Design a protein around this ligand. Structure first.
Ligand SMILES: *CCC(=O)Nc1cc(F)cc(Cl)c1Nc1ncc(OCc2c(Cl)c(OC)cc(OC)c2Cl)cn1
Length: 270
């Protein structure tokens, strides 16, 4: 079936599968993800197919594995760690971020008063996602569904972009740039629009975008040149970034390079 890639194959017998994470992806213990200390265990996540999967379902998982191999590694993406391809079911092994997705992370750290999430820390979350996206962009990866739910948080509060390698497998209208919504055109610039929405998620501590506004009314609100209002405590400089991300014309929005530089300047100024 699948060929042995010497650069990624990991011994099936050295991975002990554990609790499911959603329906399949499973929590596992891998022994020897560090070649330096190959007795050392680490917690990872394993994507595999359920028993009623078609030949097309295999093809899609192979395709995600092969795409992640080629994009390579970065501090701010969920990285490929290894694969089990031989004499058994296909396992794709990736980093497991202990604190879950950025949405639930922020929503659980909502104060009743001041909360344990400072301005610098929130800007830091935004900067780390911009760095992640600038990398994926340099590897010619268009995400297409950048949102706080698709950003995971490690034990050391590092941001890692999830699911940047999906094929055509299971819309989030509120996060989509107009050219996506209307023309089904996805570019790096349309990802910049989604970044602007994510900025707003961060500075509402995981708020739901366009509060109360049925999806039917969003399209005509955007065509009329209306956008989400500045969130309660959001400094203007940050709202200004969000707005730039929400320019109708894609060529008018910032590049991920410019977002990294802008957020860098805010953190240096602190
Ligand atoms: C690590 C321990 C743990 O339980 N972590 C939890 C717990 C939880 F309730 C929610 C989450 Cl999101 C996590 N973290 C976590 N879950 C899954 C995960 O990997 C899934 C995955 C991703 Cl994000 C990507 O993106 C590149 C690809 C693949 O497979 C190709 C998978 Cl399986 C990471 N962290």
């Amino acid at each position: 079936d699948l060929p042995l890639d010497p650069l990624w194959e990991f011994p099936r017998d050295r991975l002990v599968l554990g609790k499911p994470l959603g329906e399949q992806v499973v929590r596992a213990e891998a022994f020897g993800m560090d070649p330096a200390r190959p007795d050392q265990a680490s917690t990872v996540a394993v994507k595999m197919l359920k028993d009623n999967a078609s030949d097309k379902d295999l093809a899609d998982l192979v395709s995600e594995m092969e795409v992640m191999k080629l994009i390579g590694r970065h501090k701010n993406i969920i990285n490929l760690l290894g694969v089990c391809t031989q004499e058994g079911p296909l396992y794709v092994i990736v980093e497991c971020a202990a604190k879950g997705n950025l949405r639930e992370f922020l929503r659980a750290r909502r104060p009743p008063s001041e909360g344990p999430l400072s301005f610098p820390v929130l800007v830091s979350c935004a900067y780390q996602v911009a760095r992640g996206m600038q990398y994926l962009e340099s590897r010619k990866c268009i995400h297409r569904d950048l949102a706080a739910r698709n950003v995971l948080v490690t034990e050391d509060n590092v941001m890692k972009i999830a699911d940047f390698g999906l094929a055509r497998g299971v819309l989030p209208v509120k996060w989509m740039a107009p050219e996506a919504l209307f023309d089904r055109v996805y570019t790096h610039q349309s990802d910049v629009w989604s970044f602007g929405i994510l900025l707003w998620e961060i500075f509402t501590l995981g708020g739901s975008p366009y509060p109360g506004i049925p999806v039917e009314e969003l399209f005509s609100l955007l065509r009329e040149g209306h956008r989400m209002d500045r969130p309660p405590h959001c400094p203007p400089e940050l709202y200004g970034l969000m707005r730039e991300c929400w320019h109708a014309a894609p060529s008018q929005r910032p590049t991920f390079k410019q977002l990294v530089e802008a957020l860098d300047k805010v953190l240096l100024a602190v």
